[PDB]
Amino acid sequence: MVLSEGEWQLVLHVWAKVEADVAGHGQDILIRLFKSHPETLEKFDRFKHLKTEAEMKASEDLKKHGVTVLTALGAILKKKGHHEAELKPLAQSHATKHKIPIKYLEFISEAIIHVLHSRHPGNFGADAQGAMNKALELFRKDIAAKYKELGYQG
Ligand code: HEM
């Protein structure tokens, strides 16, 4: 898979909007993921005690982790597909430490797209969506490759 320059520009255009409230987005994205796919919460020792949306929104630590996740993702997308060095420490931790199947990266991808629509009603069109989808798909495929490289079936 390869994106056009056009597609990458739309991805980065949308990302600047995320970077205006990273905490806000990172918080909503984690919560969306936890709500839609509750089995993902169980992977988080620090958070799995959070039963409901209202509890999740009042956790400062969940908000902080959202910043962590979006910071790393942002550094990756900014590379426009030349992201191998950024991917390695990430593939390493999520494969060997955290034990996250690739299927869960598809779920958080869907969460990101949803939050982007919720947070940017008039901004985020069919085209930007198509671009973000391809960018996230690229990330998922290349991280799946790095899992296999480390000996893991993602
Ligand atoms: C765009 C997707 C993702 C990015 C960029 C990302 C990034 C990160 C980063 C930077 C960390 C902290 C350092 C590390 O442990 O590697 C982290 C920790 C973690 N990630 Fe992810 N992650 C992603 C998706 C997921 C998903 C889908 C799950 C589980 C369903 C997951 C589970 C975890 C866990 C359990 C930790 C350790 C959290 C802690 O207790 O501090 N990640 N992730």
**DSSP string covering 25-81:** HHHHHHHHHHHH-GGGGGG-TTTTT--SHHHHHH-HHHHHHHHHHHHHHHHHHTTTT
Report the nearest atom of ligand 1 relative to the CA of 104: 27
* Residue 73 Cβ < 6 Å to ligand 1: yes
Domain that holds residue 25: 1-154
What is the C-alpha end-to-end distance of the chain, expressed in Å?
Answer: 19
Return the CA Rg of the chain: 15
Here the tokens at position 85 are 């060095």
| Phi, psi (deg, nearest 5) at residue 121 | -35, -55
* Residue 100 Cβ < 6 Å to ligand 1: yes
**Number of domains forming the structure of the chain:** 1
- Pocket mutation for ligand 1, best pick of 93, 99, 139, 146 (most atoms within 8 Å of C-beta): 93
CATH (domain of 8) = 1.10.490.10
Task: Identify the experimental approach.
Answer: X-ray
Nearest CA to 125 among 33, 44, 7, 31? Answer: 7
* Residue 108 Cβ < 6 Å to ligand 1: yes
